[PDB]
Design a protein around this nucleic acid. Structure first.
Length: 1033
RNA sequence: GCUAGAAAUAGCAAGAACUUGAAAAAGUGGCACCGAGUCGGUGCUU
């Protein structure tokens, strides 16, 4: 019936789930192929695909290659020729002297009314089509997406959004006056750095601006990388270099560099448009002409000066060509930087060299027309020049009038290539590109499974990479530098009387204690250093208005009753008393401008419609561009119908969600996530994403434009927010007065005063009268879904493509010679095929095997076995094929939800980060159910006895658990979480218990696989083909 | 390209599995309900 798909895209896993209207996951019967007696299996429509990174055919197909680009461009030229064909069917010296560069021809064709030869017109059009420019800016050129100021603000906004801890606030800066000024790149960089006292040229932001100006910054110090990663936007090989860089540090910084590129284009766009002589001209071509003219002037001046003053070495400049001279610059293989390095001392020595040096320092002296800068030209400019030329030559050529929109669409449409090329064009690491391809294939298979019925909704989450612990110190270092700078600026030696290190500053209440100068925020009294348990953590902006649990919106105080009776920010009576202390904490860079604004928001009226809209946009809109591109790919592949007009019929809505929504949903209703148990949590996150997405699109359809990707009817702030909290409640079409979007999930709403508001048991849409949430059946359903033990975890088997390396193994049945008599004995062996041997084997397998020493091979039974091939043995125990002589664990430990929640609460004991009432009730819940620990150990034991089969390790960990049974529950739960690594899917890894270290238990024997059941799994695992290998022989 | 010279050589100018296919590529895996130890059972219907 009606359904929706939830997706959790990551770098090592892709979670997927299908939900119905009642938020249930269907369980269906699937056919089982092969030659066994099992012909049907019942499977739950929920799972997660796993795929380790590596060298694969698919991977190379998704990499950018010169050849694919080349054929693309060639195709475009072919189309252009096809457009000119039907009418075409019905000088060198002159050209070069009249137009010494193509930009002369272009500017003439845009600014000349005279009739031109059609061949030159074709040359111009082909040059504009072949190198059409980037598509990072969407739509027509306008100051909103073109001026340097707005894009610089957008860059620092993206920066602060990506970090928010120690962010940069830039309001006084005049980005236009600094970046657009006519000076050298390095001097512009230093001039911008001078306006930011907290950042330096070698910092991350400094390196980003340097990258945007056209320099070659080094990002090793910003990310501590082992290998040097240099980036230059103008260089043609920047994209794959960025893809390498992003692969090292993750794709979260991808959008950052994208904004940097945009800033570069903006600076260039202001640098090119500055020489705007006439309003109706062609700025790019005219500027290239001016560059040519300056080149010509400087050239003739150089020859004059050289001939008069320096007769010697003229041949070295214009005749030798072997040492990168001017003759080498024009006729030889000498780059612009080499020519500058060669001609710098000649200009330094000579007299009468004024004016040439100010151009030399600005890197605009004797420039060529084919240089590294043309990659930055947007396509809207070429579209403008094309429109101008078409308008000038409209009456002369009728087919330009007839095919104007055709040519324009060919240049602007993004022709339509393959899906592999669309994924290859993306800006990200090969991992997320692989994941995107896998996601598309997963969607295709899922809609195939549902009788070719497309879902109503496809909810997308970009799964976050949990902390790798190398970053667990970086955050502590940044907050530590903030504390040290604030203390040194103020002058209160709290660190002298109470020394602390960056390790202890991870605690929320201690970090807030040091952020607040060891003083109460609301009262003029010193805080007790060793009585923080009695102290409460208050939210500057209540949770009823906005879900912000960062340090930016948190304070530490002895009692949260001091904020007063209002549900808003703390009252003016406290602000008036503490304004001096808050202004000293403000000017000491202990807090940001926004935090001071929120603390002092009652002085400027209180919450406003603009503030609530800003909160909604902060919570509901996704800033990451990569997510929008994934949604674009899925939307284009899923939605392809139209109507009579040129309007796209959107049958499937692609909803984009933030991780904070699902995380807070788990934390608020105790649907806790523990990644260490098994790999099911990806699928579970996908399911909860589907639930949350469907709930938001059903409750607030008019807010689709905020999350759903597409071109929808725009909206404002008046129709959304009610005048009064209660006096307009349930009597207007306004959806919500409180700015937190996730309130409709809650049954009750606790405000900042303590009054507990009640909401109906059944949530329905106001306009259409459709039930959107049943607060009873749906929570029971969610818990039931999280309790299901059968979740489809599939490891993508891949042939390796790129101490020899085995591409894949093969199952061979034949006979061999044994003993002195050379008697033939039938054998079945696992042979490893090297990457080199793969071609020869696929060319002629039998001859290869006969050369290897096998006799009488059965060609039909030769079975290809890539890495991670799954085999099943007795009692459902499963093993994956790692190599020709080693196996990996193939089972997933399914743990009941009650034990998962108990384990989370035991581990998250000190870091609950919640209200005291529920925190104490959770503590009592953990303490009362200590027996659950023994129960959990029993679970792993039975599970281990069934599928792991490691008696020695099990005895060791059982004994080690028996020695430390009386230890506290927190550390005990942590050591059980560590102990779960023994049963984790994949390769055995060494893990640490309380004082024990359990070494890996390798599986060196491989003979049993030869008589097990090989299970060929589809990408989702719903479709299985099971081959009983014991029957082959 | 311009001037000389038998040349050589000199002066100048200027800008997963399976099926079909060679391949790209097309195809192959029923619907509800009660449960839930890696999925089981029942009804309908191929």
């Amino acid at each position: 019936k009606k359904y929706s798909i939830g997706l959790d895209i990551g770098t090592n896993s892709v979670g997927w789930a299908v939900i119905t209207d009642e938020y249930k996951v269907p369980s269906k019967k699937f056919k089982v192929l092969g030659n066994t007696d099992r012909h049907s299996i019942k499977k739950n429509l929920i799972g997660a695909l796993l795929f380790d990174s590596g060298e694969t055919a698919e991977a190379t197909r998704l990499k950018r290659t010169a050849r694919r680009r080349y054929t693309r461009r060639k195709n475009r030229i072919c189309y252009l020729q096809e457009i000119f064909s039907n009418e075409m069917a019905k000088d060198e010296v002159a050209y070069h002297e009249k137009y010494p560069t193509i930009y002369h021809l272009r500017k003439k064709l845009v600014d000349s009314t005279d009739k031109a030869d059609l061949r030159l017109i074709y040359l111009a059009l082909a040059h504009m089509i072949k190198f059409r420019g980037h598509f990072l800016i969407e739509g027509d050129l306008n100051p909103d997406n073109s001026d340097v100021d707005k894009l610089f603000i957008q860059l620092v906004q993206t920066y602060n959004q990506l970090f928010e801890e120690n962010p940069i606030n830039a309001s006084g800066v005049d980005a236009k006056a600094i970046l657009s000024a006519r000076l050298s790149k390095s001097r512009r960089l230093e001039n911008l750095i001078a306006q930011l006292p907290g950042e330096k040229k070698n910092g991350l932001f400094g390196n980003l601006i340097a990258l945007s100006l056209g320099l070659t910054p080094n990002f090793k110090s910003n990310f501590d990388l082992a290998e040097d990663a240099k980036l230059q936007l103008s260089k043609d090989t920047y994209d794959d270099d960025l893809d390498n860089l992003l692969a090292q540090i993750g794709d979260q910084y991808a959008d950052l560099f994208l904004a940097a590129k945009n800033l570069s284009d903006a600076i260039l766009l202001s640098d090119i448009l500055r020489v705007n002589t006439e309003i109706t001209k062609a700025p790019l071509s005219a500027s290239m002409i001016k560059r040519y003219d300056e080149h010509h002037q400087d050239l003739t001046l150089l020859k004059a000066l050289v001939r008069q003053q320096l007769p010697e070495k003229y041949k070295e400049i214009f005749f030798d060509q072997s040492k990168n001279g001017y003759a080498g610059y024009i006729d030889g293989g000498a780059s612009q930087e080499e020519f500058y390095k060669f001609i710098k001392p000649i200009l330094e020595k000579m007299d009468g060299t004024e004016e040439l040096l100010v151009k030399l320092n600005r890197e605009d002296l004797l420039r060529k027309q084919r240089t590294f800068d043309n990659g930055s030209i947007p396509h809207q400019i070429h579209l403008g020049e094309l429109h101008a030329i078409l308008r000038r030559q409209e009456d002369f050529y009728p087919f330009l009038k007839d095919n104007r929109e055709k040519i324009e669409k060919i240049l602007t449409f993004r022709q339509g290539d393959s899906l592999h090329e669309h994924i290859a064009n993306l800006a990200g690491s090969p991992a997320i590109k692989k994941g995107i391809l896998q996601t598309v294939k997963v969607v295709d298979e899922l809609v195939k499974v549902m009788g070719r019925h497309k879902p109503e909704n496809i909810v997308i989450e970009m799964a976050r990479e949990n902390q790798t612990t190398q970053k667990g110190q970086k955050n502590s270092r940044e907050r530590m530098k903030r504390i040290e700078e604030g203390i040194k600026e103020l002058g209160s030696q709290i660190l002298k009387e109470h020394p602390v290190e960056n390790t202890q500053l991870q605690n929320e209440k201690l970090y807030l204690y040091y952020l607040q100068n060891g003083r109460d925020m609301y009262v003029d009294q010193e805080l007790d250093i060793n009585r923080l348990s009695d102290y409460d953590v208050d939210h500057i902006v209540p949770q009823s208005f906005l879900k912000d649990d960062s340090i930016d919106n948190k304070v530490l105080t002895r009692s949260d009753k001091n904020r007063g009776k209002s549900d808003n920010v703390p009252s003016e009576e406290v602000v008036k008393k503490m304004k001096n202390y808050w202004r000293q904490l403000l000017n000491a860079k202990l807090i940001t401008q926004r935090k001071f604004d929120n603390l002092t928001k009652a002085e400027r009226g209180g919450l406003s419609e603009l503030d609530k809209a800003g909160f909604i946009k902060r919570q509901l809109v996704e800033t990451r561009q990569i997510t929008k591109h994934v949604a674009q790919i899925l939307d284009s592949r899923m939605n392809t119908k139209y109507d009579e007009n040129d309007k796209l019929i959107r049958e499937v809505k692609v909803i984009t969600l933030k991780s904070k929504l699902v995380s807070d949903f788990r934390k608020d209703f105790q649907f806790y996530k523990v990644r260490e148990i098994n790999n099911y949590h990806h699928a579970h996150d996908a399911y909860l994403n589907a639930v949350v997405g469907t709930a938001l699109i059903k409750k607030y359809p008019k807010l689709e434009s905020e999350f759903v990707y597409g071109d929808y009817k725009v909206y404002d702030v008046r129709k959304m927010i009610a005048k009064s909290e209660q006096e307009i409640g349930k009597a207007t079409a306004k959806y919500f007065f409180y700015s937190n979007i996730m309130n409709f999930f809650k049954t009750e709403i606790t405000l900042a005063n303590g009054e507990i508001r009640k909401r109906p048991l059944i949530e329905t849409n106001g306009e259409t009268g459709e039930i959107v949430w049943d607060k009873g059946r749906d929570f029971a359903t969610v818990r039931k879904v999280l309790s299901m033990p059968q979740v489809n975890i599939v490891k993508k088997t891949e042939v390796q493509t790129g101490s020899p390396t085995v591409a894949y193994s093969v199952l061979v049945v034949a006979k061999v010679e044994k003993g002195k008599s050379k008697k033939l004995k039938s054998v079945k062996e696992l042979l490893g095929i090297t990457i080199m041997e793969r071609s020869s084997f696929e060319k002629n397998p039998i001859d290869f095997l006969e050369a290897k020493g096998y006799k009488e091979v059965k060609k039909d039974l030769i079975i290809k076995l890539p890495k991670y091939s799954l085999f099943e043995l007795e009692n459902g125990r499963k093993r994956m094929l790692a190599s020709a002589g080693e196996l990996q664990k193939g089972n997933e430990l399914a743990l009941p939800s009650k034990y998962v929640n108990f384990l989370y609460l035991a581990s998250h004991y000190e870091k609950l980060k919640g209200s005291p009432e529920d925190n104490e009730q959770k503590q009592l819940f953990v303490e009362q159910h200590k027996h659950y620990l023994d129960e959990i150990i029993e679970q792993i034991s039975e599970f281990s006895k069934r599928v792991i089969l490691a008696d020695a390790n099990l005895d060791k960990v059982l004994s080690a658990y028996n020695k430390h049974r009386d230890k506290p529950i927190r550390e005990q739960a942590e050591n059980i979480i560590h102990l779960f690594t023994l049963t984790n899917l994949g390769a055995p890894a060494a893990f640490k218990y309380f004082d024990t270290t359990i070494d890996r238990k390798r599986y060196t024997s491989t003979k049993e696989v030869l008589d097990a059941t090989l299970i060929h799994q589809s990408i989702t695992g719903l479709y299985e083909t099971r081959i009983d290998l014991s029957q082959l022989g």
